Amino acid sequence: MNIFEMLRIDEGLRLKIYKDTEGYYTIGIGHLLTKSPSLNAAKSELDKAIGRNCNGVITKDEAEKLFNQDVDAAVRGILRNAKLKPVYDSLDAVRNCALINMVFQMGETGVAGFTNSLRMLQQKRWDEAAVNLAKSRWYNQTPNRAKRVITTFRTGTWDAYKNL
Numbered sequence: 001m002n003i004f005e006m007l008r009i010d011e012g013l014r015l016k017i018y019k020d021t022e023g024y025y026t027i028g029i030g031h032l033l034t035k036s037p038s039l040n041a042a043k044s045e046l047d048k049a050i051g052r053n054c055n056g057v058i059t060k061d062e063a064e065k066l067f068n069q070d071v072d073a074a075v076r077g078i079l080r081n082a083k084l085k086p087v088y089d090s091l092d093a094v095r096n097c098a099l100i101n102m103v104f105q106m107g108e109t110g111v112a113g114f115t116n117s118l119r120m121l122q123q124k125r126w127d128e129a130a131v132n133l134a135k136s137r138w139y140n141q142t143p144n145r146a147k148r149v150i151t152t153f154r155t156g157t158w159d160a161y162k163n164l
């Protein structure tokens with residue numbers, strides 16, 4: 001398992017504009033287009049992202065390209081963030097995928113807000129971090145994915161994604 005396969009399982013793949021769990025216009029593999037309620041604004045953002053008149057639909061190749069760009073950005077974001085980098089530097093490869101997953105979903109800012117959990121992760125207090133991460137809107141709104149990610153931080157293995 002790797003970050004791409006992981007996110008692909010959590011985000012799925014849709015080639016037509018859709019609304020995510022929060023109701024925001026999205027496409028491809030969880031690529032957020034806009035928080036605005038206007039479908040036209042989304043269509044505009046899509047064309048700008050792809051470089052052509054898409055009329056709300058893209059190809060699989062286009063979806064994968066946006067995906068590579070998004071994973072790269074999430075990684076770069078972590079590495080430039082003063083609160084996130086130290087955590088990332090402290091973790092093993094499997095657990096860092098869980099951190100990338102969160103950033104991909106909630107953004108750098110959102111993740112930087114889990115101050116307490118972040119400190120527990122840095123200290124390698126896995127079970128404690130797991131409980132703390134669960135006390136969040138994130139866990140209450142998307143419990144299945146949150147459990148997978150949390151199990152990943154807790155065990156340092158891919159068990160939660162095996163058999164999916």
Ligand SMILES: [Cl-]
Nearest residue numbers: 134135136137
């Ligand atoms: Cl809570």
Ligand SMILES: [Cl-]
Nearest residue numbers: 142143144145
């Ligand atoms: Cl979920």
